[PDB]
Amino acid sequence: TTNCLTKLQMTIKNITLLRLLDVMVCNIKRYIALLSTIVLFNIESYIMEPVNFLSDLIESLKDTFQEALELLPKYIRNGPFLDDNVTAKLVYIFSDLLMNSFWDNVKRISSDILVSLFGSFDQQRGFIIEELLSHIEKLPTKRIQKKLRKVQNIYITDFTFTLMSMLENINCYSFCNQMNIDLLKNEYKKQEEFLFNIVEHINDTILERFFKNPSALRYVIDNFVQDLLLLISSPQWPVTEKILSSLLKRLLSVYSPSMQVSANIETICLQLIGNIGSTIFDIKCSTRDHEDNNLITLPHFFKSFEECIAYNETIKCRRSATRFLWNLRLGTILIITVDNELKKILEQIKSTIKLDYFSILHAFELLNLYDPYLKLILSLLAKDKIKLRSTAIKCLSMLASKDKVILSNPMVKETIHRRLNDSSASVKDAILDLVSINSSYFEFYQQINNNYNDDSIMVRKHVLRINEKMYDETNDIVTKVYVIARILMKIEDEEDNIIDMARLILLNRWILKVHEVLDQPEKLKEISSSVLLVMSRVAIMNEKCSQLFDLFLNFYLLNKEAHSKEAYDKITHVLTILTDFLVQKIVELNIVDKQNFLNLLAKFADSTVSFLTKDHITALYPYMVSDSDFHYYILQVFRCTFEKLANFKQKFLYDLETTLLSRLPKMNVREIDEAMPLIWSVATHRHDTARVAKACSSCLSHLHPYINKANGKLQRLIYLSTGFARFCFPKGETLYEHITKCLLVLSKDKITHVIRRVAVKNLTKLCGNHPKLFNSRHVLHLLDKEFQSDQLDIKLVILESLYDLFLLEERKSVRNTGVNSTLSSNGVCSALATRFLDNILQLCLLRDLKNSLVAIRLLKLILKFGYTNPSHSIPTVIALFASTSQYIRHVAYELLEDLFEKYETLVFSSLSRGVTKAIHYSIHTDEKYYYKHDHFLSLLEKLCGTGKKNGPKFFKVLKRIMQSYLVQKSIFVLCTNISNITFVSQYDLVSLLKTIDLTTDRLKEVIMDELSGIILIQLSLQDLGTYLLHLYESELKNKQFSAQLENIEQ
DNA sequence: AAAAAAAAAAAAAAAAAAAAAAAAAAAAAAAAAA
DNA sequence: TTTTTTTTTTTTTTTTTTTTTTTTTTTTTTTTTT
């Protein structure tokens, strides 16, 4: 009965054969569990029956239940009378139950029973070990806190929680309690050998079962190693250090030769070894001052051992853990002091602690194994596997996260600046993360910015983030200008997100940053000054940045359609105070900085809106009237301002006109074309302005005798007349028509060369300002005659005027239509470019640096605009590759790169003509130094050798060129350029060698049949073949200096 | 005013070359939801 | 304060077609004979 059983249990508890038999009989047939618990408390059939009853209960289930499972381990630990047969069933059922609130308690009870069974029996270690290992597939894939143990907010999976205690339960120190030190040494040796063998067995089986199915069975190890990392910092688990140690070497054996595995296995093992290395390096770094323990501080770390043991046994003893820790000291203890300490220990037997515990691990293998991990990481950095490289760089990054001074050694600097220049998207991202997490990364900022235009979106975004971080962090003006220039470059891209991010960060760091203070004193004098200095520095240094800055300031900041009205008044206000501060700085300062500030002011005035007021005009006036390049930017600012503002004072306008007309003879042509538009702009605000008419009439009367004479003062006179014509009086003939007639009169053959050039330049400028004048036949015939008269300087001024006209017209066209939203519900320049394209191309190949640069600039501008066909100019650019000058070659390379990226089909189509023209220019220019320069074919090859088929296509074009040419100097330069070509594949090289051998053999029979040129070209081809062979089924397998030698001929 | 054979020009079928699309797989980070 | 599902990036596997040739076939009109 239940009452009888309860009374019997109470009597047994108070006190502490027939009853056991009755309990067994009752269990055979809630009451059964109570009887089994009573029998267990009182205490092979009596045990075999309760075990079977518990097995049936567990099978059916899978507070009244838990007392039997709680009193079972006590009997197991106390009574060893259980035979080997009954132990197997309990071991197996409890191993099954351990894997798969009250359930956690049941699992803990099962773990306690398993460790008690391990401790009680010394001949069943392998049995329980294999039983626990056979259920390794039941580990949870995800580290959800629900099915996890504890022990600190540290969650431990149940399998290794049982396994670590089981392994540390060897506790040979207890044998020391049982006991001329001869027997204990042998016992300790046997115990340590047994533990070493079983830990190697566990590691081997874990790695084997992970290698069998690495993709699906990753968690089987992924948890374990990870948990081994979470438990290594606790002194309460010393055996864990061993578990990782023999494990780590196994991972180090993964990449050893004769152990080849799949790519996924390599990546997983590298991630695991990287985590292990990071953990052990973190442990090593956080130590005392002296932690050598390098097998060679000995007297005083026994005190550390004793303190650690005492603290462990004091707080949370867990007697198995401290028993194993006592054993761990045997290897260390086994000089005079060491012997005395060992004798004392034997006689006794017969935050700060966390740092102290790391000191004792240095003498062990785990901490000494860090160097092989680093060597393996460095070795794997250089392999061709992209995933391996990325994972290794990630491991280096997570290693350097703990210690920021790991970059001192040069073997990491070498890898980083080699990988920054050439890598893939993932590798570049990993190396950028590595350099960004480290505290100092200004040493490689140039390398980081060199990859700002990568194809991958992720690398570009991360580089932009690095640039923003550098701008926010550093204070050096040079690096700040560099990073802000890169950010401004990144405002145009094929990704809307990238350009939006760049615009947002630029707005935050140029406009909103100034708006934060909101007219707060003692803070605007620094941040606004720095921002204005940055903006001034942008407008220089590759003025494409200046163009992007103008675009950003005009078509983004001042467009009310782009952003909300409430977000536009702030922009306008910030720009107003910025302009006021810039004007004030210009006033007080009145050097390159001054020019930059003036350029910034001119750009601000040229904007779509006027942020300047009459007060700024009055402030600029005192040094405007007073008499450098100041008056040029000042005149530009005045011209831009007077086209938007009005309601000026009459007296001020009269004074401005007086001071402008007084200085007209003194000012040179450089700023006359801004002074005259200013004159007209100020004249139209002060109607009845006949004063400018009288001033123009004076110039006309002074110029009239000169034109009659045609049938130091004349230069300025004609310049002023042309300026008045093209900038004043736009409405019995019109003034500019009379000026064109006068210029045509002064542009005859009998006229002197200098005045003729000045007159033709002025006529070109006037026709540029008045397109209708280009329709007149006389000016067209004059321009054609100048272009076909072989004039060195007359053509140059026309080209410069056309360049200026093209720039102005394109700027006006871009400003006419910018960025806007259109709702349905709501050619002179091209003709001039096409007509004179041949003349420009012919002048591009001149031997004079100035004329060549002017012609190249005009050609580049025309090609960028797209007025004419690039096919007519593709060879010319290629001919510029033959130029010896480095700058001409570089600008030609940039132009050809742009032309390729636009029209690669036409570029490939015109390669033959380009090579022919380049060879002709090379032989024509340097009649004796023609073979000296041979750096045009290789640069063209690398430009068109970045594609999968661009290589074979370029080689096919090269073979066509070689066959076409089979002139002596042409063959010399072609051979010298071939000598410097890097060949992609050996099939191409052997084909070229066969062609050259056939050609030289044929020339050999030619010379034998037959003078100097033929033998010289034969010798040249033979020397090319010899140099090529001395530098570096067969055809199918093959598919996978020279100038001095040529000169030595004669 | 009658018949056969050969100069061919289009119109499909193969033998690859080559340039991207679909579709896991893996980290890495950020917005819900207990 | 943790786990959950989106959202974003390369990576690798095949799997697509879009080419560029080389073949054979088919039919067309012009040469040959009465």
Residue numbers in the entry: 221 to 236, 250 to 262, 278 to 291, 304 to 322, 336 to 373, 386 to 436, 439 to 466, 473 to 589, ...
Task: Provide text from the study.
Protein complexes containing SMC and kleisin subunits organise the spatial arrangement, or topology, of DNAs in most if not all living organisms. All contain a pair of rod-shaped SMC proteins with a dimerisation domain, known as the hinge, at one end and an ABC-like ATPase domain at the other, separated by a ~ 50 nm long anti-parallel intra-molecular coiled coil. Their association creates V-shaped dimers whose apical ATPase head domains are interconnected by a kleisin subunit (Scc1) whose N-terminal domain forms a three-helix bundle with the coiled coil emerging from Smc3's ATPase head, called its neck, and whose C-terminal winged helical domain binds to the base (or cap) of Smc1's ATPase head to complete the ring. Scc2 is essential for cohesin’s ATPase activity, for its loading onto chromosomes, for maintaining cohesin’s chromosomal association during G1, and for cohesin’s ability to extrude loops in vitro.
To elucidate how DNA actually associates with EQEQ cohesin trimers in the presence of ATP and Scc2, but lacking Scc3, namely under conditions in which DNAs are clearly entrapped within E-S and E-K but not S-K compartments, we used cryo-EM to solve the structure of EQEQ cohesin trimers (Smc1, Smc3 and Scc1) bound to ATP, linear DNA (40 bp), and Scc2C2 (residues 151–1493) to a resolution of 3.4 Å. First and foremost, E-S/E-K entrapment does indeed arise from the clamping of DNA between Scc2 and engaged heads in the manner revealed by both high and medium resolution cryo-EM structures. Scc2 holds DNA by way of a curved basic and polar surface located around the transition between its neck and head regions. The surface, which causes the DNA to bend slightly (~9°), is created by the spatial arrangement into a semicircle of a series of residues (e.g. S508, N557, K714, S753, S783, and K1324/25) from the ends of six α-helices and one loop (containing K427) that together engulf the phosphate backbone. This region includes all four positions mutated in Scc2-4E (S717E K721E K788E H789E), thus neatly explaining why the charge-reversing mutations lowered the binding affinity for DNA and inhibited entrapment of DNAs in vitro. Highly prominent is the binding of Scc2 to Smc1 through the docking of HEAT repeats 18–24 (residues 1127–1493) onto the F-loop (residues 1095–1118) on Smc1 head’s C-lobe and the coiled coils that emerge above. More conserved is a major contact mediated by salt bridges between a collection of highly conserved aspartate and glutamate residues located within two loops of Scc2 (819-EDEED-823 and 781-DD-782) and two key lysine residues (K112 K113) in Smc3. While Scc2 holds the upper half of the DNA’s backbone through a spiral of basic and polar residues, the engaged heads of Smc1 and Smc3 produce a 2-fold pseudo-symmetrical ABC ATPase heterodimer that binds DNA through two sites that are exactly two turns of the DNA apart and coincide with the major groove in the DNA.
